[PDB]
Scaffold this motif. Sequence first.
Motif, PDB file in Angstrom:
ATOM      1  N   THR A 177       1.014  -1.243   0.063  1.00  0.00           N
ATOM      2  CA  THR A 177      -0.209   0.033  -0.030  1.00  0.00           C
ATOM      3  C   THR A 177       1.018   1.207  -0.048  1.00  0.00           C
ATOM      4  O   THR A 177       0.422   2.349  -0.327  1.00  0.00           O
ATOM      5  CB  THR A 177      -0.948   0.073   1.199  1.00  0.00           C
ATOM      6  OG1 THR A 177      -0.147   0.161   2.308  1.00  0.00           O
ATOM      7  CG2 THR A 177      -1.787  -1.375   1.231  1.00  0.00           C
ATOM      8  N   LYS A 178       2.173   1.282   0.255  1.00  0.00           N
ATOM      9  CA  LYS A 178       2.953   2.361   0.566  1.00  0.00           C
ATOM     10  C   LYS A 178       4.076   2.229  -0.536  1.00  0.00           C
ATOM     11  O   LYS A 178       4.973   1.470  -0.370  1.00  0.00           O
ATOM     12  CB  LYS A 178       3.566   2.484   1.936  1.00  0.00           C
ATOM     13  CG  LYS A 178       2.574   2.768   2.956  1.00  0.00           C
ATOM     14  CD  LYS A 178       3.022   2.328   4.407  1.00  0.00           C
ATOM     15  CE  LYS A 178       1.736   2.395   5.188  1.00  0.00           C
ATOM     16  NZ  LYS A 178       2.054   2.449   6.678  1.00  0.00           N
ATOM     17  N   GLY A 179       3.888   3.315  -1.459  1.00  0.00           N
ATOM     18  CA  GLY A 179       4.921   3.421  -2.607  1.00  0.00           C
ATOM     19  C   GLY A 179       6.413   3.473  -2.194  1.00  0.00           C
ATOM     20  O   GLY A 179       7.390   3.038  -2.847  1.00  0.00           O
ATOM     21  N   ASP A 180       6.515   4.357  -0.986  1.00  0.00           N
ATOM     22  CA  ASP A 180       8.033   4.583  -0.491  1.00  0.00           C
ATOM     23  C   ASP A 180       8.744   3.318   0.022  1.00  0.00           C
ATOM     24  O   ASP A 180       9.927   3.089  -0.270  1.00  0.00           O
ATOM     25  CB  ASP A 180       7.845   5.686   0.611  1.00  0.00           C
ATOM     26  CG  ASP A 180       7.593   7.266   0.233  1.00  0.00           C
ATOM     27  OD1 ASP A 180       7.433   7.411  -0.976  1.00  0.00           O
ATOM     28  OD2 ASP A 180       7.399   7.944   1.425  1.00  0.00           O
ATOM     29  N   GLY A 188      -2.498   6.728  -6.527  1.00  0.00           N
ATOM     30  CA  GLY A 188      -1.255   7.689  -6.115  1.00  0.00           C
ATOM     31  C   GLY A 188       0.057   6.696  -6.040  1.00  0.00           C
ATOM     32  O   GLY A 188       1.031   7.344  -6.641  1.00  0.00           O
ATOM     33  N   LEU A 189      -0.067   5.437  -5.724  1.00  0.00           N
ATOM     34  CA  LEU A 189       1.110   4.512  -5.541  1.00  0.00           C
ATOM     35  C   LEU A 189       1.571   4.268  -6.954  1.00  0.00           C
ATOM     36  O   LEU A 189       2.869   4.247  -7.488  1.00  0.00           O
ATOM     37  CB  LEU A 189       1.001   3.227  -4.670  1.00  0.00           C
ATOM     38  CG  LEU A 189       1.893   2.344  -4.601  1.00  0.00           C
ATOM     39  CD1 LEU A 189       1.703   1.735  -3.352  1.00  0.00           C
ATOM     40  CD2 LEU A 189       2.241   1.500  -5.829  1.00  0.00           C
ATOM     41  N   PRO A 196      -7.786   6.273  -4.339  1.00  0.00           N
ATOM     42  CA  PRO A 196      -6.744   7.498  -4.402  1.00  0.00           C
ATOM     43  C   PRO A 196      -5.447   6.968  -4.061  1.00  0.00           C
ATOM     44  O   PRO A 196      -4.484   7.383  -4.595  1.00  0.00           O
ATOM     45  CB  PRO A 196      -7.459   8.478  -3.238  1.00  0.00           C
ATOM     46  CG  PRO A 196      -8.936   8.081  -3.601  1.00  0.00           C
ATOM     47  CD  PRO A 196      -9.257   6.478  -3.696  1.00  0.00           C
ATOM     48  N   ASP A 197      -5.340   6.007  -3.238  1.00  0.00           N
ATOM     49  CA  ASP A 197      -4.328   5.393  -2.560  1.00  0.00           C
ATOM     50  C   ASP A 197      -3.509   4.443  -3.818  1.00  0.00           C
ATOM     51  O   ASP A 197      -2.173   4.137  -3.763  1.00  0.00           O
ATOM     52  CB  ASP A 197      -4.454   4.701  -1.478  1.00  0.00           C
ATOM     53  CG  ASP A 197      -4.774   5.723  -0.106  1.00  0.00           C
ATOM     54  OD1 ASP A 197      -3.654   6.344   0.161  1.00  0.00           O
ATOM     55  OD2 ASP A 197      -5.684   5.847   0.025  1.00  0.00           O
ATOM     56  N   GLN A 205       3.274   7.050  -8.831  1.00  0.00           N
ATOM     57  CA  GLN A 205       4.589   7.645  -8.067  1.00  0.00           C
ATOM     58  C   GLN A 205       5.348   6.519  -8.733  1.00  0.00           C
ATOM     59  O   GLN A 205       6.662   6.921  -8.736  1.00  0.00           O
ATOM     60  CB  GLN A 205       4.452   7.221  -6.622  1.00  0.00           C
ATOM     61  CG  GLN A 205       5.742   7.713  -5.815  1.00  0.00           C
ATOM     62  CD  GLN A 205       5.688   7.110  -4.404  1.00  0.00           C
ATOM     63  OE1 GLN A 205       4.786   6.482  -3.934  1.00  0.00           O
ATOM     64  NE2 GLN A 205       6.809   7.691  -3.823  1.00  0.00           N
TER      65      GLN A 205
HETATM   66  O1  LIG Z   1       2.161  10.079  -3.375  1.00  0.00           O
HETATM   67  C1  LIG Z   1       2.754   8.744  -3.185  1.00  0.00           C
HETATM   68  C2  LIG Z   1       1.724   8.071  -2.024  1.00  0.00           C
HETATM   69  O2  LIG Z   1       0.478   8.126  -2.287  1.00  0.00           O
HETATM   70  C3  LIG Z   1      -0.626   7.772  -1.419  1.00  0.00           C
HETATM   71  O3  LIG Z   1      -1.872   8.111  -1.687  1.00  0.00           O
HETATM   72  C4  LIG Z   1      -2.391   9.574  -1.361  1.00  0.00           C
HETATM   73  C5  LIG Z   1      -3.410   9.460  -0.564  1.00  0.00           C
HETATM   74  O4  LIG Z   1      -2.920   9.302   0.899  1.00  0.00           O
HETATM   75  C6  LIG Z   1      -4.105  10.729  -0.431  1.00  0.00           C
HETATM   76  O5  LIG Z   1      -5.461  10.544   0.257  1.00  0.00           O
HETATM   77  O6  LIG Z   1      -4.558  11.044  -1.705  1.00  0.00           O
HETATM   78  C7  LIG Z   1      -3.277  11.288  -2.588  1.00  0.00           C
HETATM   79  C8  LIG Z   1      -3.857  11.854  -4.055  1.00  0.00           C
HETATM   80  O7  LIG Z   1      -5.018  12.893  -3.711  1.00  0.00           O
HETATM   81  C9  LIG Z   1      -2.523  10.126  -2.828  1.00  0.00           C
HETATM   82  O8  LIG Z   1      -1.388  10.323  -3.613  1.00  0.00           O
HETATM   83  C10 LIG Z   1      -0.467   6.161  -1.552  1.00  0.00           C
HETATM   84  O9  LIG Z   1      -1.325   5.731  -0.485  1.00  0.00           O
HETATM   85  C11 LIG Z   1       0.993   5.854  -1.028  1.00  0.00           C
HETATM   86  O10 LIG Z   1       1.220   4.495  -1.385  1.00  0.00           O
HETATM   87  C12 LIG Z   1       1.931   6.630  -2.161  1.00  0.00           C
HETATM   88  O11 LIG Z   1       3.344   6.453  -1.835  1.00  0.00           O
END
Ligand SMILES: OC[C@H]1O[C@@H](O[C@@H]2[C@@H](O)[C@H](O)O[C@H](CO)[C@H]2O)[C@H](O)[C@@H](O)[C@@H]1O
Length: 247
Positions: free
Chosen positions: A149-152, A187-188, A183-184, A191
């Motif tokens: 779940t965590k891109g980092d 986002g990952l 969104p997660d 990234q």
């Molecule tokens: O940005 C990289 C990380 O993105 C994370 O998701 C973010 C969400 O937590 C947040 O609610 O929204 C933004 C976009 O609006 C998302 O980028 C991921 O959960 C991470 O895994 C990732 O590293």
Amino acid sequence: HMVKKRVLLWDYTNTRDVKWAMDKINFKGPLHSCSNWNTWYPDELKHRLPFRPMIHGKNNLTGGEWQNILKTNEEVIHFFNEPERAGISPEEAAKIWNDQVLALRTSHHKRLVSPSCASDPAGIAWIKKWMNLVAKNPPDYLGLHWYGTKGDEMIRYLESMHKEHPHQPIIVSEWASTSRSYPDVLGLTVQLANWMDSTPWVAEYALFGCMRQMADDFVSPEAQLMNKDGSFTDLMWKYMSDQPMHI
Ligand SMILES: OC[C@H]1O[C@@H](O[C@@H]2[C@@H](O)[C@H](O)O[C@H](CO)[C@H]2O)[C@H](O)[C@@H](O)[C@@H]1O
Ligand SMILES: OC[C@H]1O[C@@H](O[C@@H]2[C@@H](O)[C@H](O[C@@H]3[C@@H](O)[C@H](O)O[C@H](CO)[C@H]3O)O[C@H](CO)[C@H]2O)[C@H](O)[C@@H](O)[C@@H]1O
């Protein structure tokens, strides 16, 4: 210049049920190759991308399965898929590599991807031992899976495996966000696509989920690249169309 490192993972259920879906792929974007966890070629691809056959498990070493591997015109071949979870020891896989698979390089001039293990201590330990056992005949690429779940954490894992095994480039043969929050997932995916695109020692990467049904309970329905009708999700569109990727 358009960076082209993205693999199209094409599950055999697509070939079985929705061939036509392949003709809806965008081939003018950053898609660069294709694999299907199998020795045999997906005809519907019509050679529009290079195909990487796979020696998935012990069931693919004999008969028509091995004939598909011996006869292929394609340049890059994957060894075992998560062998640590199919009761294949490093020692057993090293023996099969020396006795049977290595000939695909020395004699047929193919490039060979290591077995692709899971990103858990069991997988990290399996590939560490196997790479040491075949150090005198190493693979052309290191094959990696990563789900989380965590891109980092995926970045830190790739950087970690690149330091531990610095002698060849890395192919991420499977990866995806397992987050149930879209969104997660987006986002990952965005990234890691953009990060891997600008990282030279990542040869290619393969986003999982382009199939009609969920593979299992582990992967996220929000990370699916195909809908139940065989049409593509917006995540799949972005994966195959956008470079850089954007949310
Ligand atoms: O940005 C990289 C990380 O993105 C994370 O998701 C973010 C969400 O937590 C947040 O609610 O929204 C933004 C976009 O609006 C998302 O980028 C991921 O959960 C991470 O895994 C990732 O590293
Ligand atoms: O067993 C179900 C499923 O497991 C998959 O492998 C996962 C790993 O992807 C997962 O990786 C963890 C990361 O998500 C996290 O961010 O970092 C930790 C280390 O700090 C990683 O271990 O680890 C779990 C084990 O707890 C594995 O199950 C397989 O690839 C997949 O084939 C299988 O369906």
